[PDB]
Scaffold this active site. Structure first.
Site, short mmCIF file in Angstrom:
data_model
loop_
_atom_site.label_atom_id
_atom_site.label_comp_id
_atom_site.label_asym_id
_atom_site.label_seq_id
_atom_site.Cartn_x
_atom_site.Cartn_y
_atom_site.Cartn_z
N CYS A 1 1.19 -1.08 -0.43
CA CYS A 1 -0.04 0.05 -0.54
C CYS A 1 1.01 1.07 -0.26
CB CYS A 1 -1.00 -0.05 1.13
SG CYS A 1 -2.74 -1.04 0.38
N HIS B 1 -12.56 -7.60 1.47
CA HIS B 1 -13.39 -7.82 1.30
C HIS B 1 -14.31 -6.67 1.87
CE1 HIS B 1 -13.20 -11.30 -1.15
NE2 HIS B 1 -12.60 -11.93 -0.31
#
Ligand SMILES: CCCCC/C=C\C/C=C\C/C=C\C/C=C\CCCC(=O)O
Lengths: 379, 379
Positions: free
Chosen positions: B159, B205
C-alpha cells in the site's frame, strides 16, 4: 572548470549459486524418467543434446538426488506429478533465496571498501519470487542495513531486469554523489518446474537455472578512482515493433511460467542492429569502437542471432558462451555474470602494463520485446 | 551558496477509477447472499457499517449486476464459489487496467502541459497485477510514447508503493533536470476476491477497492517555477522492529491475497512518532510546522492510530476520511488521492493571491512493517 561530471561506477560485484551443479546429461535423464514425458523423449534428446549447456545450478536437490545434501528434502512429489501449489513454491523461493542473496550481497559490499552501514538504497530484482514482506526486508535484518534504507522491488521484468536495476541505481547515485546503492538480481527457476507435455515447456526445462548476482554502485568523478576505471556512461532501450508475442509471462497455480516464441530469435536478428547502432550514434561510435560485448546468454539462438545481427565473432561473445555453458539461463542476473568475467580480464590487463578495454556494451531482452542495454567507457 | 539545486516537482496529476461505483449497502448484500460464508455471516453487517466506507469502485460488474455495461460479462462463476485461477484473474487485470491507466496517464500529461513525446521515464506500480508484456508496454502502444522510454515495474510492495515510485522518479529527474518522468499507480483488488470463510478476509473484502492515479515529475531550479510551487524536498523510510506479521502478502492459486494482523494499528501508533519526528528533525522542523498531513486511508483503525500517535486532529486528516469514504482502500494510489485533494485547495488559494500550504508530509505503510514518506515544502 576542467570537469566535475559525476559518472556511475560499479564499486563492487559478486556472483552466487546454490548447492547443486547438474550436468545436462543428468538433467536429460531426470526429465525423461518423468512419466507423461515418456512419449516426448526424442525431442528431449534433441533439445538437451544440442544445448551447449554443460551444467546448471539448482537450489532444490530433486534433479541431483545421488549427491543431495543431508537434511535437504526433495521438493517435488513422490508420484512424479510435479504438482505443487504456487504459494508453496514461493515459500521455497524465499527459503532458499535468503541464504543465497545475503551471501552475494555481503561479498558485493566487501568488493568495494565499504561497511554494511554505507548503503542508502536497495534494489532487489526477481521474476521468480514474490513474497509478503520482501527479500528487501530480509536483507535489512541479516546484514544489518540501516533501517532507513530506500527499498525498491523490481518484479517480473524478465531476463533484462538487471539493466532496469542499473538505471534505477545510476539515477540515484548521480543524484547523490557521496552515497551508495546495492542492486541484486536473483532467480530460482528450479522452484517453478512442472514438466508439461508441450515442447515449449520442454525447451524452458532444458534452459532456465538458478543464480544470483549483486553489484554496488557509487557516484564518482574522474579523480576518485584508479586509472583504468570503467563507468556506465549511458543506457538505452528500444521497444521493438511487432514483437508482442516474443516473450510471454504468466503466473499460474502450478508455478510462474513462460512461453518463448519460435520467431523470437528472428525478432532479435532483425532489430538488434538498430538498437546498437542507435545507441552508439549518440557517442559518435561504431560497432568497431566497442572492445567487448556482454550479450545475455538466454540460450543458443539468442547469442547466435545477436552474433548474426551485429556481425560479431564467437570470440567477441566467448564470455556469453562461457556463462551459457557453465550456468545456462539464470534469467536476469545472467548478464551480470558475463560482466564479471569481463571485469576479471579487465583489471588483469590493468595489473600488467595494458590499458584494458576502452568501450563496452552490455544488453539483454525484456518482454515487449524490448532491448535493454548499458554502455561503459573508461573515465 | 550553491544555487544550482534541482528539486523534484509534480508537474501534472490525474486520478481515475474503474466503471462500477458500488455502495456499501450493495456490497453487503452481495456478501451475505454468498453460500460458503456461513460461519462469519452474523458479523458481516457490522464490518460493512463500521468501515467508514460509503462506496467504492470495481472493474467487474459482479458486484453491481443490474448496471453491467452492454457487453461486459460476469467474471466470477455462477457457482457463487469465487474459484478463479490466478492466470485468468491476471488476464482480467490486463483487460481492465489498460484502458484505465491509458486515460489517467493522458490526463496527467495534459495537466503538466506536456506532450506524450516529452516523457522519458515510465514507472508502473502494482501489487494486484503482474503481466507478461506489462502495462508499461501497453502505455507505449496506447499513448504513442517514445520507444526509447526508460521503463520500470515496481511490484508487490503493498500500500506504500507510491512512495517508492516517487523516490525512483525523483532520483531520475534530479539527475536529469530537463527530462520528464511519469509515475503511475494502478490497482484492481476486485479481480482477487475469494470470499473465504475467514474473519480476516471478510474485513479485507469490505475495505479493498479499485483505483488509479498518475503523476508527472520534473526537476526544477530555484525560480524555474510559478510562485507558490510545492516540491518534494526529501524522502524518508523506516523499518519497524518485530512487526513482520503486520502486512503479509501471498500469491495463491485462487488469486493474490492479503492478510493483516489485528496488531497492525498498534504497530503504527507505537512507531509513527519515531518515523515522523525522524523525518522532520533532518530539516530542523517539528509537527507544528506541518500544514497538511496525507495519511494513507487504509482503514478505520489505520487512520485513527496515525491520529493517536501523532496527535492529529480529525480536521487535518479530513482528506484521508474523504478518500476512504468515497473510494475505500485502493492500495498504492490511495495516498495520491488524498494528496490530490490538498493540491486542489492549494492551487485555488494561489489563484486568489493567498500564500497556500507551506509544508506537508505524505506517508504510507509497506510490508515490514516499514513506514514510507515524502516531504513537500514551498519554493
Ligand atoms: C464486497 C466485496 C468486494 C470485493 C473487493 C475486495 C477484494 C478483497 C481482495 C483482496 C485481495 C488482494 C490482495 C492484493 C494485495 C494487497 C496488499 C495491500 C497491503 C495492505 O496494506
Amino acid at each position: 572548470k576542467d570537469e566535475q561530471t559525476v559518472y556511475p561506477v560499479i564499486a563492487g560485484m559478486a556472483i552466487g549459486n546454490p548447492q547443486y551443479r547438474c550436468t545436462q546429461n543428468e538433467a536429460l535423464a531426470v526429465a525423461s524418467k518423468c512419466p507423461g514425458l515418456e512419449s516426448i523423449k526424442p525431442v528431449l534428446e534433441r533439445i538437451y543434446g544440442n544445448s551447449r549447456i554443460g551444467s546448471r545450478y539448482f537450489a532444490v536437490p530433486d534433479f541431483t538426488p545421488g549427491r543431495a545434501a543431508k537434511g535437504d528434502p526433495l521438493f517435488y512429489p513422490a508420484d512424479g506429478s510435479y504438482q505443487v501449489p504456487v504459494d508453496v513454491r514461493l515459500d521455497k523461493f524465499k527459503e532458499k533465496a535468503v541464504p543465497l542473496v545475503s551471501d552475494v550481497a555481503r561479498r558485493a559490499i566487501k568488493e568495494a571498501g565499504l561497511n554494511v552501514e554505507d548503503i542508502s538504497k536497495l534494489v532487489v530484482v526477481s521474476s521468480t519470487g514474490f513474497l509478503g514482506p520482501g527479500l528487501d526486508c530480509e536483507l535489512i535484518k541479516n546484514l544489518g542495513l540501516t533501517r532507513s534504507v530506500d527499498r525498491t522491488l523490481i518484479g517480473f521484468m524478465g531476463c533484462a531486469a538487471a539493466m532496469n536495476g542499473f538505471r534505477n541505481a545510476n539515477d540515484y547515485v548521480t543524484a547523490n554523489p557521496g552515497k551508495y546503492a546495492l542492486m541484486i538480481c536473483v532467480e530460482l527457476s528450479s522452484v517453478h518446474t512442472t514438466f508439461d507435455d508441450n515442447i515449449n515447456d520442454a525447451i524452458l526445462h532444458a534452459i532456465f537455472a538458478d543464480g544470483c548476482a549483486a553489484a554496488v554502485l557509487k557516484g564518482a568523478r574522474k579523480s576518485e578512482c584508479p586509472k583504468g576505471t570503467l563507468a556506465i556512461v549511458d543506457n538505452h532501450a528500444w521497444l521493438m515493433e511487432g514483437t508482442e508475442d516474443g516473450i510471454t509471462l504468466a503466473i499460474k497455480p502450478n508455478g510462474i511460467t513462460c512461453t518463448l516464441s519460435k520467431f523470437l530469435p528472428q525478432y532479435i536478428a532483425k532489430n538488434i542492429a538498430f538498437f546498437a547502432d542507435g545507441f552508439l550514434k549518440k557517442h559518435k561510435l561504431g560497432r568497431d569502437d566497442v572492445d567487448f560485448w556482454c550479450v545475455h546468454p538466454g540460450g543458443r539462438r539468442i547469442i547466435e542471432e545477436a552474433q548474426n545481427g551485429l556481425g560479431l565473432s564467437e570470440e567477441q561473445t566467448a564470455d556469453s558462451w562461457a556463462v551459457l555453458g557453465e550456468y545456462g539461463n539464470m534469467l536476469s542476473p545472467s548478464v551480470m555474470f558475463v560482466l564479471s568475467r569481463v571485469f576479471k580480464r579487465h583489471n588483469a590487463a590493468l595489473a600488467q602494463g595494458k590499458p584494458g578495454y576502452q568501450t563496452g556494451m552490455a544488453f539483454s531482452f525484456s518482454p515487449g520485446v524490448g532491448a535493454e542495454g548499458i554502455l561503459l567507457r573508461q573515465i
